[PDB]
Amino acid sequence: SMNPPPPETSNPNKPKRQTNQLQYLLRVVLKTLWKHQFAWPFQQPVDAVKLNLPDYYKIIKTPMDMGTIKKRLENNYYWNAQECIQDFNTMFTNCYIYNKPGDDIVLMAEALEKLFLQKINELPTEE
Ligand SMILES: CCc1cnn2c(NCc3ccc[n+](O)c3)cc(N3CCCC[C@H]3CCO)nc12
Ligand SMILES: CCc1cnn2c(NCc3ccc[n+](O)c3)cc(N3CCCC[C@H]3CCO)nc12
Numbered sequence: 001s002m003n004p005p006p007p008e009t010s011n012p013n014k015p016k017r018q019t020n021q022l023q024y025l026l027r028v029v030l031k032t033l034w035k036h037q038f039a040w041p042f043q044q045p046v047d048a049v050k051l052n053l054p055d056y057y058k059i060i061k062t063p064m065d066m067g068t069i070k071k072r073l074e075n076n077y078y079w080n081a082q083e084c085i086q087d088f089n090t091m092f093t094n095c096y097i098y099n100k101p102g103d104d105i106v107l108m109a110e111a112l113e114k115l116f117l118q119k120i121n122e123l124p125t126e127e
Helices: 020-034 066-074 081-098 104-120
Strands: none
Touching: 020 066, 020 081, 020 104, 066 081, 081 104
């Protein structure tokens, strides 16, 4: 009945690299999603103590949110662009998993996911 600690966002012992892909994922993909009208419930970890969703962390064992993703990109936590893509997909599917078809929050996630898909369509190619 407590929240878990948020996902890890730093690790100064992971080797770091910059790539066109990871730069795009921050400066275009994360940025565009963050500014979307439906982004606000996805900008931080689900707070199941403030929100009254008590079974949330019984159901969602791989939490993810765009606040975390932003930190991970900023701290060069990701080596492969796909690690970041995976985290966006985990965020969307967690919303689908906890909730049910037709729920307002699921329609918000679906809209954000469609946007995600249009932006990643233009991801630069891997090195
Ligand atoms: C307005 C501030 C706020 C936002 N969430 N939240 C919650 N969340 C729990 C929750 C969620 C859904 C239904 N219910 O019934 C409770 C409790 C709570 N408070 C209870 C304890 C005494 C203080 C009082 C305000 C804080 O100091 N205040 C807040
Ligand atoms: C990724 C965030 C998330 C996942 N589930 N969920 C729920 N689920 C409950 C539920 C049930 C039936 C219909 N709907 O629409 C939702 C609500 C909720 N929030 C409260 C309502 C305003 C937005 C938003 C704020 C806090 O993240 N946020 C979330």
